[PDB]
Design an enzyme around this catalytic site. Structure first.
Site, short mmCIF file in Angstrom:
data_model
loop_
_atom_site.label_atom_id
_atom_site.label_comp_id
_atom_site.label_asym_id
_atom_site.label_seq_id
_atom_site.Cartn_x
_atom_site.Cartn_y
_atom_site.Cartn_z
CG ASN A 155 29.61 -5.79 -7.75
OD1 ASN A 155 28.95 -6.38 -8.45
ND2 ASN A 155 30.53 -6.07 -6.81
NE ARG B 182 33.99 -3.91 -9.80
CZ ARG B 182 34.96 -4.27 -8.65
NH1 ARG B 182 34.52 -3.70 -7.62
NH2 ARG B 182 35.99 -4.70 -9.06
CG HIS C 204 40.28 -10.36 -6.62
ND1 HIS C 204 40.59 -11.53 -5.99
CD2 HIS C 204 39.10 -9.96 -6.12
CE1 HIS C 204 39.62 -11.90 -5.06
NE2 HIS C 204 38.75 -11.01 -5.16
NE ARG D 103 34.99 -17.27 -3.00
CZ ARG D 103 35.39 -15.98 -3.60
NH1 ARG D 103 36.04 -15.99 -4.58
NH2 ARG D 103 34.70 -15.33 -2.73
CD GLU E 282 38.25 -4.49 -6.14
OE1 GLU E 282 37.68 -5.23 -7.10
OE2 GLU E 282 38.43 -4.53 -5.02
#
Lengths: 379, 380
Positions: free
Chosen positions: B7, B73, B162, B223, B366
């Protein structure tokens, strides 16, 4: 017999109703259109026209037992939430709320100025469409944004259709012959604007419109819920200005944005004819409504009753069916014979054994406002 | 045998060397402070080469490690890329044109791709898109109620994010229940640094809480989640802010930190217990929003078999889970206090035995999911 003249003074139109608050009769209702576009150049001419319309249907305000004029104001911010008897100082202060409702609050202030001139010998009272939701719990009222910024600019979920949500909640309690204070309910006001509320007793716990009437359900021309990133995305990629985006969301979105249809009742025939855009518009509308019902079932934990109201809610059986179908495991069972039967007045549309009751309950905002005016003036 | 999953962000590069067949990480780590004055890692080329040295250090020489792919990713695949995609120069060209959908995250991922393909040219490089799982959302969920011609021109829809975690957890929930995934209706609550919920019918998601971008939906660390879009026009008009400053505020100075000044939940808990009002408010706002999404998705599904908590917060914070689903017995959810408070960290039941809807904690992985996606698309 006493009467209250209830006024809604908009930019291009003025709506009025002379209402008897005791037995609920409207002696006269009307609308003055095309203000300042026209034979009606300003709001002064408009109110005078309303007087002539009243006179033409046999009403003399001098002999009608007029005891108050009720003025509808969309946004009372955090400072005005109860019915408010008007004077010069209050009216000056009301001017400060205009950034919260720049399209709708100013012409209401024009209606007050004209009405107080032409009807100087009776009380004028403002009623605020945000008022019912003033005491929303902090958990529901507070957006998850920078707190210092929120406080400074009084940013919060205000909520709208407050008069309607409260009135319908009271009428549902009356229909069920249960004390309002012991009831938990959802009200779905589906009209030109659409909003949902979750109400415990006399206190709303949440409602779908927000800072402004844009948030929440899909509406005739309003998008309802969307990622706020839509604004910066459209500004960056499409080169649109912020006000252009906001205007698009308020006026070229919702059902009309998706399908081109301006009259909700036309959607059905277009769908039946195979119009994919009309089907999509209706599906998007229905899906959002289903989510708000589910969400508010969760907020309430126990829900006694769900009521549909306003122009669409009171009349469109398909909307109501599609809003709660497939929710029997959540305690909602509609009776399609009752849903389809029509009728005026409040009625049950759920099956007798439905854990949660479902009603159609007609709203009457003007009657509620008339009663508010009488109450604040002494009863 | 092994897949290097990366990532690649602007300031850090997370890596994991994964064995997908034994479901094991051979080695894990991070390169941090990319481009900083005192940092020996000025760019993404340096960052990846550091990761190699670390792997060597833990017994894995990439020469003998059996490395058969690199999984990259990528946050946003738009409407163009939604399956694991074998990378070549043509794919990379097409990808660049999507950056307006994720201007902060996609470009550093593409930098990681360039470096890795150059430094590891004898293995396949595969992109996995965090939007991919939700590409086939039903039109009623994917489509915002805005001007249709405008939406189509600029490819505006609910994308969702996600996706790797939602899909993997949905699969693991079905496995835990000894039931075929196709026959299950479920809700997945991914509560970590970002927070999102999904409603899934079999292999097909029906709705998800994030939107065009990862801002929409649940309250998160920094957020806002759901807010009246009028917030932008209002702040630009009254406070004189630019659009981009409002967007930045909503992404970086909002959520739990915006309301409490806190970055954690671990910290939130002790502030709350010591009587901090801002902490309590922040957590109440978070909890209210999450309860609404659960109810909303129960209505979307109609019948729900299972609800699973996942990610950093969902896997470890018993209070969050208790506050999220308590008082929903009439909606078919009965939580068990003892099970919820269990110390174990594997997939597990937290509902009472007789709860009409099963409630689980199902740890996400993940990196394992992506490692397996790479092997699969390459024929393995």
């Amino acid at each position: 017999a006493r009467r209250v003249l209830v006024i809604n003074s908009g930019s291009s139109s003025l709506k009025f109703q002379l209402v008897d608050p005791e037995f609920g009769v409207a002696a006269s209702t009307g609308i003055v259109e095309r203000i300042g576009e026209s034979p009606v150049p300003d709001h002064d001419a408009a109110l005078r026209r309303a007087f002539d319309m009243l006179a033409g249907d046999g009403v003399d305000l001098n002999t009608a037992g007029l005891v108050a004029v009720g003025h509808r104001v969309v946004h009372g911010g955090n400072t005005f939430y109860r019915p408010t008897v008007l004077d010069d100082a209050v009216i000056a202060r009301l001017h400060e709320l205009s950034e919260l409702a720049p399209l709708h609050n100013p012409p209401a202030l024009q209606g007050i100025e004209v009405a107080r001139r032409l009807l100087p010998d009776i009380a004028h009272v403002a009623v605020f469409d945000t008022g019912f939701f003033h005491d929303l719990p902090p958990a529901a009222a507070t957006y998850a944004i920078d707190r210092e910024l929120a406080d400074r600019w009084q940013i919060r979920r205000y909520g709208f259709h407050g008069t309607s949500h409260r009135y319908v909640s009271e009428q549902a309690a009356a229909f069920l012959d249960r004390p309002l204070r012991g009831l938990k309910q959802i009200v779905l006001h589906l009209g030109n604007g659409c909003s949902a509320s979750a109400i415990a007793g006399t206190r709303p716990l949440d409602t779908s419109m927000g800072l402004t009437p844009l948030e929440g359900l899909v509406m005739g021309t309003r998008s309802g819920d969307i990622d706020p990133s839509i604004v910066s995305y459209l500004c960056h990629t499409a080169g649109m200005g912020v006000d252009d985006v906001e205007s698009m969301l308020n006026h070229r979105s919702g059902v009309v944005g998706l399908s081109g249809v301006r009259d909700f009742r036309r959607l059905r025939e277009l769908i039946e004819s195979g119009d994919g855009a009309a089907q999509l518009a209706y599906s998007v509308f229905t899906h959002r409504l289903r989510k708000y019902i589910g969400a508010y079932l969760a907020v309430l934990g126990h829900t006694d009753v769900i009521s549909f109201t306003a122009g669409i809610g009171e009349n469109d059986a398909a909307v109501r069916r599609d809003a709660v179908s497939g929710m029997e495991e959540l305690g909602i069972v509609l009776d399609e014979r009752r849903n389809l039967a029509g009728g005026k007045g409040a009625r049950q549309i759920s099956a007798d054994d439905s854990p949660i009751t479902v009603l159609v309950v007609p709203t009457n905002e003007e009657l509620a406002i008339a009663r508010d005016c009488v109450r604040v003036l002494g009863g």
